[PDB]
């Protein structure tokens, strides 16, 4: 979360600790995203920081265009897999872990998002809304 | 070095009688009446004549004697407040946000209610003390006026209001918003 995130976010189950790799779901040239940090996460001895739906992470691209590899950039988690629970009572989950590469302000690097996108992320990051097909 | 006696005069004027037992002062005049307790001090009051009353300290140090003038003054301002009375004026001060000031009442209350102070989302209230009345001066812009018989209650009621409008987290020399005391005087005019 943080910059450019207009909205607050209700807690959702943390799915992705540091080291996790999600699918890159944009058209940027990136094939996956390797999580090295979660923004706005706190501190407890021994705890991995771990992201969830609509969290902004800091990632590198393990697989993808060489102009994207070997460096750290912001991304946003768009699909989960660890099931979480909404305030309408529902426990839900996607089939994959996936997020999209983005700028500190929260602008997509790419122009499409392939696959669905959870609403809690859509609601959080307007330029993600824009590029989303099926939401939730 | 201990001064064998030092004394002071408290002059008494035509409309008032002041009566003292133990060290309890009752001053009564045209404007009503005021009483104050001087037990915490150790001075000796003595009447010379309906228009004169002395106060004296025997064998006192610096600090004791220092307290003797301040007894004179304290009882003076009781006497003047019961004749001329006291009136403090304050004015609102703001660069952008017009400070709106009312008088509300919850349960026999009387409070001075300050809205909008610097845009401030909170509604400020200062209770009106007893013995003190409040007029928003006609003919003058953003002037509040506190009056009554007791300088101490008027003065403090005033300072309660000014202090309820201190600014936080701003350069207080650029952000001069406030309600400041602007004139200290009397209720009866000519004097």
């Amino acid at each position: 979360s943080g910059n450019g995130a207009q909205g607050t976010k209700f807690r959702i189950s943390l799915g992705l600790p540091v080291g996790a790799i999600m699918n890159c779901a944009d058209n940027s040239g990136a094939r996956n995203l390797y999580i090295i940090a979660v923004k706005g996460s706190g501190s407890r001895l021994n705890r991995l920081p771990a992201a969830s739906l609509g969290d902004m992470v800091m990632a590198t691209v393990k697989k993808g265009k060489p102009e994207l590899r070997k460096k750290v950039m912001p991304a946003i988690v768009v699909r989960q897999a660890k099931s979480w629970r909404r305030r309408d009572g529902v426990f839900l989950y996607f089939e994959d872990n996936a997020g999209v590469i983005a700028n500190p302000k929260g602008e997509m690097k790419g122009s499409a998002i392939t696959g669905p996108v959870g609403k809690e992320c859509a609601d959080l990051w307007p330029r993600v809304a824009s590029n989303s097909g099926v939401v939730v | 070095m201990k001064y064998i006696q030092t004394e002071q005069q408290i002059e008494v004027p035509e409309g008032v009688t002041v009566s003292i037992k133990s060290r309890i002062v009752k001053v009564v005049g045209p404007r009503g009446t005021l009483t104050k307790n001087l037990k915490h001090i150790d001075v000796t009051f003595t009447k010379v004549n309906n228009q004169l009353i002395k106060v004296a300290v025997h064998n006192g140090g610096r600090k004791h004697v220092a307290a003797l003038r301040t007894v004179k003054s304290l009882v003076d301002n009781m006497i003047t407040g019961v004749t001329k009375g006291y009136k403090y004026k304050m004015r609102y001060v703001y660069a952008h946000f017009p400070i709106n000031v009312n008088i509300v009442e919850k349960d026999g209350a009387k409070f001075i209610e300050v809205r909008n102070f610097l845009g401030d989302k909170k509604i400020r209230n200062v209770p009106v003390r007893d013995g003190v009345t409040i007029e928003f001066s006609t003919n003058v812009k953003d002037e509040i006026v506190l009056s009554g018989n007791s300088v101490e209650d008027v003065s403090q009621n005033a300072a309660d209001l000014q202090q309820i409008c201190r600014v936080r987290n701003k350069d207080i020399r650029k952000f001069l918003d406030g309600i400041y005391v602007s004139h200290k005087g009397f209720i009866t005019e000519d004097l």
Partner: protein, 152 residues
């Protein structure tokens, strides 16, 4: 710009930015208060403001009817509807410019009024006119932002 769709063109307009051109055409984005955003106060002031009774104003060709309503302090009321409805007539009556055929509204209040159609009928220059009304309002920073600097 190049031709666009109806929905699309409107959406881009409201952003205040156009990508190909890469210009932020409008300095600040337009937003409307949620009503969650507004300040929460107990409103009355002196217990409520003034109130008007039923009013009627009849020209002899048009008739206006008004239902008794109440106004409170520190509030804002919108008036909507089509022209020729007597939206203008109503405001005038409250201004005291017009006398009601029936009903009365004699308030103690001091009123400032701005007319709908503005045609000049004042001799004098623009600065002189505004200074007579009030100087000091001209000093405020708010007025610099909205009037003075934009138009010049």
């Amino acid at each position: 710009t190049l031709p666009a769709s109806v929905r699309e063109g409107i959406n881009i307009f409201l952003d205040g930015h156009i990508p190909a051109e890469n210009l932020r055409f409008r300095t600040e984005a337009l937003q409307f208060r949620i009503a969650d955003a507004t300040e929460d106060l107990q409103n009355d002031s002196a217990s409520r403001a003034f109130s008007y009774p039923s009013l009627k104003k009849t020209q002899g060709d048009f008739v206006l009817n008004v239902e008794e309503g109440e106004f409170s302090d520190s509030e804002i009321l919108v008036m909507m509807g089509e022209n020729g409805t007597g939206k203008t007539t109503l405001i005038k009556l409250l201004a005291g410019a017009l006398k009601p055929d029936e009903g009365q509204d004699i308030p103690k209040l001091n009123v400032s009024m701005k007319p709908q159609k503005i045609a000049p009928k004042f001799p004098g220059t623009v600065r002189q006119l505004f200074f007579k009304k009030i100087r000091g309002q001209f000093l405020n920073p708010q007025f610099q932002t909205d009037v003075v600097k934009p138009l010049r």
